[PDB]
Design a protein around this ligand. Sequence first.
Ligand code: HEM
Ligand SMILES: */C(=C/C(=O)O)C(=O)Nc1cc2cccnc2c2ncccc12
Ligand SMILES: O=C(O)/C=C\C(=O)Nc1cc2cccnc2c2ncccc12
Length: 153
Amino acid sequence: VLSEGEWQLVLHVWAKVEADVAGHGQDILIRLFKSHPETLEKFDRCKHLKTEAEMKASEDLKKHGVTVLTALGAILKKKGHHEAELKPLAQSHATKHKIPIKYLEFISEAIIHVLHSRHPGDFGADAQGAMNKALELFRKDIAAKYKELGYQG
Ligand code: HEM
Ligand SMILES: */C(=C/C(=O)O)C(=O)Nc1cc2cccnc2c2ncccc12
Ligand SMILES: O=C(O)/C=C\C(=O)Nc1cc2cccnc2c2ncccc12
């Protein structure tokens, strides 16, 4: 459980993401793929890491980054009351895409990295810790739903 104050720190920095969801999404996915290139294998080959400029020019990558951050922002605004939003995400990510929790840890790391790089004034230790707790709760709850669907990843 997060405190109300911790939720507020989470949603305060999230409002900065909402000013430009696509740009944040691009930086987060580029960080993910550079730091953990194996995560490209969950998409069509082109399993090969392209240059940063090719990733920034990609209409498909920019769309993916907005798909992710739209869904995650709706989850964070529920302040832990997110069973109904996690249900369809667990369904697809466990049964169709097959995304292991360790890849959700990787993308959580990439989100925290970009938020710290772009908004340090809104992302000191207390806010970083609140965002860490919020993303740990997301991963814990999605993992329990994965198991309910028979996926142990
Ligand atoms: C914060 C974490 C994430 C969120 C909120 C998220 C959200 C979404 C949403 C909303 C969709 C579209 C609807 C659907 O298929 O469920 C989607 C599709 C997808 N996601 Fe995720 N995702 C996350 C993490 C990841 C990660 C880490 C990977 C891979 C390493 C991944 C792989 C996919 C794939 C392969 C698709 C299908 C894309 C396509 O067919 O074009 N997701 N995701
Ligand atoms: C590969 C690269 C290119 O520029 O031709 C390619 O099109 N394959 C591919 C990679 C990829 C990576 C991350 C997310 N989504 C994708 C793709 N999505 C749809 C079709 C192909 C994709
Ligand atoms: O565009 C597509 O049709 C498929 C994906 C893909 O990654 N192609 C590439 C394949 C490679 C193989 C070996 C080394 N480098 C690369 C490479 N380097 C940069 C950008 C793209 C690629």
